[PDB]
Design an enzyme around this catalytic site. Structure first.
Site, PDB file in Angstrom:
ATOM      1  N   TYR A  16       0.802  -1.234   0.000  1.00 52.93           N
ATOM      2  CA  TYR A  16       0.000   0.000   0.000  1.00 52.93           C
ATOM      3  C   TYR A  16       0.803   1.236   0.000  1.00 52.93           C
ATOM      4  O   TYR A  16       0.225   2.354  -0.135  1.00 52.93           O
ATOM      5  CB  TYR A  16      -0.735   0.124   1.313  1.00 52.93           C
ATOM      6  CG  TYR A  16      -1.657  -0.930   1.389  1.00 52.93           C
ATOM      7  CD1 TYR A  16      -1.262  -2.133   1.886  1.00 52.93           C
ATOM      8  CD2 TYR A  16      -2.886  -0.795   0.782  1.00 52.93           C
ATOM      9  CE1 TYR A  16      -2.094  -3.183   1.864  1.00 52.93           C
ATOM     10  CE2 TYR A  16      -3.741  -1.824   0.772  1.00 52.93           C
ATOM     11  CZ  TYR A  16      -3.332  -3.040   1.325  1.00 52.93           C
ATOM     12  OH  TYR A  16      -4.132  -4.155   1.370  1.00 52.93           O
ATOM     13  N   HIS A  21      -4.078   6.279  -1.484  1.00 52.93           N
ATOM     14  CA  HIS A  21      -4.672   6.363  -0.144  1.00 52.93           C
ATOM     15  C   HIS A  21      -3.640   6.473   0.973  1.00 52.93           C
ATOM     16  O   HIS A  21      -4.011   6.788   2.109  1.00 52.93           O
ATOM     17  CB  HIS A  21      -5.586   5.160   0.053  1.00 52.93           C
ATOM     18  CG  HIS A  21      -6.792   5.334   0.938  1.00 52.93           C
ATOM     19  ND1 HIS A  21      -7.599   6.429   0.943  1.00 52.93           N
ATOM     20  CD2 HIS A  21      -7.447   4.401   1.665  1.00 52.93           C
ATOM     21  CE1 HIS A  21      -8.676   6.204   1.693  1.00 52.93           C
ATOM     22  NE2 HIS A  21      -8.587   4.980   2.155  1.00 52.93           N
ATOM     23  N   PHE A  67      -5.925  -0.575  10.390  1.00 52.16           N
ATOM     24  CA  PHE A  67      -6.662  -0.422   9.133  1.00 52.16           C
ATOM     25  C   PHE A  67      -6.949   1.090   8.928  1.00 52.16           C
ATOM     26  O   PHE A  67      -7.173   1.844   9.921  1.00 52.16           O
ATOM     27  CB  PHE A  67      -7.987  -1.167   9.138  1.00 52.16           C
ATOM     28  CG  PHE A  67      -7.863  -2.656   9.142  1.00 52.16           C
ATOM     29  CD1 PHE A  67      -7.464  -3.341   8.012  1.00 52.16           C
ATOM     30  CD2 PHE A  67      -8.201  -3.371  10.262  1.00 52.16           C
ATOM     31  CE1 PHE A  67      -7.387  -4.712   8.021  1.00 52.16           C
ATOM     32  CE2 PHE A  67      -8.139  -4.766  10.289  1.00 52.16           C
ATOM     33  CZ  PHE A  67      -7.753  -5.441   9.132  1.00 52.16           C
ATOM     34  N   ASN A  69      -9.621   2.564   8.132  1.00 54.03           N
ATOM     35  CA  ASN A  69     -10.951   2.886   8.837  1.00 54.03           C
ATOM     36  C   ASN A  69     -10.934   2.882  10.341  1.00 54.03           C
ATOM     37  O   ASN A  69     -11.901   3.285  10.978  1.00 54.03           O
ATOM     38  CB  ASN A  69     -12.068   2.057   8.296  1.00 54.03           C
ATOM     39  CG  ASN A  69     -11.963   0.596   8.755  1.00 54.03           C
ATOM     40  OD1 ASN A  69     -11.055  -0.125   8.366  1.00 54.03           O
ATOM     41  ND2 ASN A  69     -12.879   0.186   9.546  1.00 54.03           N
ATOM     42  N   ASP A  94      -4.906  11.871   1.516  1.00 53.75           N
ATOM     43  CA  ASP A  94      -5.368  11.967   0.118  1.00 53.75           C
ATOM     44  C   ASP A  94      -6.710  12.683  -0.027  1.00 53.75           C
ATOM     45  O   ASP A  94      -7.689  12.378   0.701  1.00 53.75           O
ATOM     46  CB  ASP A  94      -5.435  10.574  -0.522  1.00 53.75           C
ATOM     47  CG  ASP A  94      -6.206   9.545   0.306  1.00 53.75           C
ATOM     48  OD1 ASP A  94      -5.915   9.378   1.514  1.00 53.75           O
ATOM     49  OD2 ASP A  94      -7.130   8.889  -0.286  1.00 53.75           O
ATOM     50  N   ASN A 115     -12.477   7.038   4.661  1.00 52.19           N
ATOM     51  CA  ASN A 115     -12.714   6.203   5.833  1.00 52.19           C
ATOM     52  C   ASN A 115     -11.903   6.546   7.018  1.00 52.19           C
ATOM     53  O   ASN A 115     -12.286   6.288   8.149  1.00 52.19           O
ATOM     54  CB  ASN A 115     -12.252   4.759   5.647  1.00 52.19           C
ATOM     55  CG  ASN A 115     -13.036   3.997   4.697  1.00 52.19           C
ATOM     56  OD1 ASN A 115     -14.271   4.113   4.660  1.00 52.19           O
ATOM     57  ND2 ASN A 115     -12.335   3.047   4.013  1.00 52.19           N
TER      58      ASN A 115
END
Length: 194
Positions: A16, A21, A67, A69, A94, A115
């Protein structure tokens, strides 16, 4: 100048690292790189932390390892430990509603379906009034494609724009610490990557 904590939102792991993100973490990584800060994994704050002195002011930094979120879990844990109120936190993230190559400072606003911002608002006691560093990533044409968009890798030319906007954002954070918010915000808001 009102900021005691800078947070860079991201998903954890190498997979990631270069997805859109994770843009907020890019900012914190480069600020920490320039200022010779080694982030430390602190399970107690559910993230990677550090502290850096700029113009006799301590700035703490955080990249959650939650995470996305559940980013508020890390941010609230750290902020409450150090008595840092939401109004003293800047969260780099972002931003769908700005293009690649632009960034902006702002206090407050909605989560825009992000999120991480949504959780942060919630865990900070439903308080929107933390600052944001909005790193433009562009957006797709339709709502339903946003998730796949923000978990994608920008193509090369976009990533160049992103990387330049991160560089500038780091410069303007240093300006924020040296000279205050109005100067830093003035500069950043007329930047467009070349």
């Amino acid at each position: 100048q009102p900021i005691k904590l800078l947070v860079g939102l991201a998903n954890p792991g190498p997979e990631y690292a270069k997805t859109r993100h994770n843009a907020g973490a890019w900012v914190v990584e480069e600020l920490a790189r320039i200022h010779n800060v080694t982030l430390k994994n602190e399970p107690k704050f559910f993230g990677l932390t550090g502290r850096l002195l700029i113009n006799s002011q301590e700035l703490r930094v955080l990249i959650p390892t939650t995470f996305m979120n559940l980013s508020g879990k890390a941010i609230a844990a750290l902020a409450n430990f150090y008595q840092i109120k939401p109004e003293e936190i800047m969260v780099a993230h972002d931003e769908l509603d700005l293009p690649p190559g632009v960034a902006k400072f702002k206090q407050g606003g909605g989560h825009g379906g992000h999120n991480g911002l949504k959780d942060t608002i919630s865990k900070l006691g439903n308080n929107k009034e933390f600052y944001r560093l909005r790193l433009g990533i562009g957006h797709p044409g339709h709502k339903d494609k946003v998730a796949g968009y923000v978990l994608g890798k920008a193509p090369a030319k976009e990533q160049e724009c992103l990387d330049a906007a991160v560089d500038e954002s780091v410069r303007c954070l240093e300006i924020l610490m040296k000279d205050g918010l109005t100067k830093a915000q003035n500069r950043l808001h007329t930047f467009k990557a070349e």
